[PDB]
Amino acid sequence: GMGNIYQITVEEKAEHQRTLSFEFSLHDDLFKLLEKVDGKMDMTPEQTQAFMVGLKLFGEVMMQQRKHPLFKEFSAPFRAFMMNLKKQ
Amino acid sequence: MGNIYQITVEEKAEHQRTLSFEFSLHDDLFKLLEKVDGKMDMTPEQTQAFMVGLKLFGEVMMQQRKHPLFKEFSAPFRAFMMNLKKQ
C-alpha cells in the first residue's frame, strides 16, 4: 500500500550504550498491522511485536532489492511463509 | 549472557504513534553492522533495516522454533542465513 515513514532507533542497554537511528519507509501501516495480529499468532505480545517489526523491516528491503542474488532464490519460500502467516 | 537492546519505532506522520521494546541477541549487533557495512550492494538504510529486522525476527523464531508458523520455514531460513554469511 501507501508508504509510511518511520524512524527506527536501536540502543544498547549496557556497556558502551551505542545507538543507531535511521529513517525507513514501509508499504503497510505497521501500527495498524500490530493491532490486527495482536493475539492471533499463538505467541506472547512481546514475541508478536518483535516478529512483526523484524519481518516488515527485512521484507521491505528484499522488496527493494528483488534482483539481488541474496534474495531471488529466497523469494519463493519467503512468499510461501508470508502467505501462511496471512491465513492466520 | 547476550546483548540487550532497546528498539523504538516512531511514525513520522499521522498521530506520531511510538512503540518501544527490548530484545536480547547473542551476537553484538553493532559489530555485525560494521562487518556488513557497504559490503552487500545495499544503501546504508537498507543494510540497517535488513540486519536489525533479520536479527529481531530470528530471535523470535529461535524462541518459537517448534511453532507451526515457523517449522516448515526453518530449512529455507537456515540456507538463507548460511548464504548471507558467504556474501
Automatic annotation (TrEMBL), chain A:
Superkingdom assignment: Bacteria
Pfam families, per database record: DUF3861
Gene3D superfamilies: Protein of unknown function DUF3861
Name of protein: DUF3861 domain-containing protein
Organism annotation: Pectobacterium atrosepticum (strain SCRI 1043 / ATCC BAA-672)
UniProtKB/TrEMBL annotation, chain B:
Organism annotation: Pectobacterium atrosepticum (strain SCRI 1043 / ATCC BAA-672) (Erwinia carotovora subsp. atroseptica)
Highest taxon, organism lineage: Bacteria
Gene3D superfamilies tied to this protein: Protein of unknown function DUF3861
Annotated protein name in UniProt: DUF3861 domain-containing protein
InterPro entries per the UniProt record, alphabetical: DUF3861, DUF3861_sf
